[PDB]
């Protein structure tokens, strides 16, 4: 193979322009190797030399499967570059040619075409939709139509899963409803596979599909994946937990009923671990997820209480990355706006007040507004119990009054309005 190593582009062009298929093959392989080096593959040089149309025509040479493979790989690597470089591959007519290769008798060639289409679809909504219009989905799914996924080569299965997840990936617009419905059954199946990378990408795909309007969430939830997601939520591999949690988080941005599916599946039992997870991002996303659950019904808030999660929210509020603490503030405001008086009182018994007040020192304006809303909802709860006096004292002897008073000097309009109000109304 050293005979095709380090060719100049002009030598590649010379070979590809010969009338000799073997010479063209050697030149295409030399191109693949150029495009396969680690540092600065000369993608722009190869494009500028006008090689793409030739590579595309080589995709069609059924009688020379080696030049199909070499050109497929060269084009994959071009398509992996910038949008402009992917566009050059698409403009050369590569999409239908790669789709035709999906059914190749040679596994390594089929797989190469899968990868290329994943790069093209991954560029954005429009190329994703163009790949779908050219009819990629049927042949892709047919490659996974086997009794047991384990009989497929591991690398081959991972590539197929990754490409399918790109077909589920972008928005503005989201994938066509019809394409999602066609893909979902195979996705649900991959989501039960034992390989961690297949599971990671399957979850990523489900998370993409559940990121949008509630109707999108519903067509996923209706397939019965929620229990499997919750299981994966407890995996040890961070690459699996992260997308599982993203999908669960998206699903609870939906209706009360969609949210109840997640609770019934047992998700809340995993949040003591997630809300203390060593990975900052897992904590953040877990707290975000909790904030949407506490925005639910009172019976849903009650299950958060029953699962002992309020002390975990007090914990995050007391100490966490600031973005996570802001999410915790939201979780508390949502809880306090939707909860019963008894649930709200309970919050106070768990120690929510002091950490809440300490966060009034944050420079961020939004979290300050959020916290003042929470404090108002709590005072409101204490008015119905005639214990506003006692609450006022709590807030006072932990530095709270100093915070709220200072917030009258605060720049933002909505802040001083809520602050001054709290003072005159509960602190005379």
């Amino acid at each position: 193979n050293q005979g095709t190593v380090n060719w100049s582009v002009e030598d590649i062009v010379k070979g590809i322009n010969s009338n000799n298929l073997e010479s063209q093959l050697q030149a295409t392989q030399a191109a693949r190797k150029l495009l396969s080096r680690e540092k600065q593959p000369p993608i722009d040089n190869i494009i500028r030399a006008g090689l793409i149309p030739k590579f595309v025509s080589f995709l069609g040479k059924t009688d020379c499967s080696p030049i199909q493979f070499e050109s497929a790989w060269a084009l994959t690597n071009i398509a992996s570059g910038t949008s402009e470089q992917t566009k050059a591959v698409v403009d050369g007519g590569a999409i239908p040619a790669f789709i035709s290769l999906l059914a190749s008798p040679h596994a390594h060639i089929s797989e190469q075409a899968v990868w290329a289409l994943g790069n093209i679809a991954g560029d954005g909504s429009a190329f994703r939709d163009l790949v779908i219009k050219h009819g990629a989905i049927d042949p892709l799914l047919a490659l996974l139509a086997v009794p047991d996924l384990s009989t497929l080569a591991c690398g081959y299965l991972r590539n197929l899963t990754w490409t399918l997840s790109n077909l589920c990936r972008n928005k503005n617009p989201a994938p066509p409803l019809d394409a999602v419905e066609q893909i979902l059954p195979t996705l649900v199946r991959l989501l039960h596979h034992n390989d961690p990378e297949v599971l990671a990408d399957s979850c990523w795909a489900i998370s993409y599909l559940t990121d949008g309007p509630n109707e999108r969430i519903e067509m996923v939830v209706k397939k019965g994946v929620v229990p499997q997601l919750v299981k994966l939520l407890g995996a040890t591999e961070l690459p699996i937990v992260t997308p599982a949690l993203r999908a669960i988080g998206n699903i609870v941005t939906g209706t009360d009923e969609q949210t109840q599916k997640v609770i019934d599946a047992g998700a809340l039992a995993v949040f003591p671990s997630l809300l203390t997870n060593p990975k900052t991002n897992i904590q953040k996303e877990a707290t975000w997820t909790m904030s949407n659950i506490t925005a639910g019904r009172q019976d849903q808030i009650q299950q958060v209480v029953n699962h002992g999660l309020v002390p975990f929210l007090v914990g995050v509020l007391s100490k966490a990355d600031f973005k996570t603490q802001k999410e915790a503030a939201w979780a508390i405001t949502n809880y306090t706006s939707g909860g019963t008086v008894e649930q709200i009182v309970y919050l106070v018994h768990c120690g929510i007040i002091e950490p809440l007040m300490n966060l009034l020192s944050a420079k961020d304006t939004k979290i300050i507004q959020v916290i003042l809303d929470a404090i108002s909802n709590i005072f409101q709860a204490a008015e119905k119990l005639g214990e506003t006096e006692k609450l006022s004292i709590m807030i006072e002897e932990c530095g709270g009054l100093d915070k709220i008073e200072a917030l009258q000097r605060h720049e933002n309009e909505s802040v001083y309005k809520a602050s001054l109000n709290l003072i005159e109304k509960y602190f005379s």
Binding site: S36, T76, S80, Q112, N119, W162, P243, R246, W288, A295
Partner: peptide
């Protein structure tokens, strides 16, 4: 007040 989200696999991969 539900709030939509609005280490993932990469959108593109080169084969080396």
């Amino acid at each position: 007040g539900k709030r939509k989200h609005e280490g993932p696999s990469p959108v593109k991969m080169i084969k080396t």
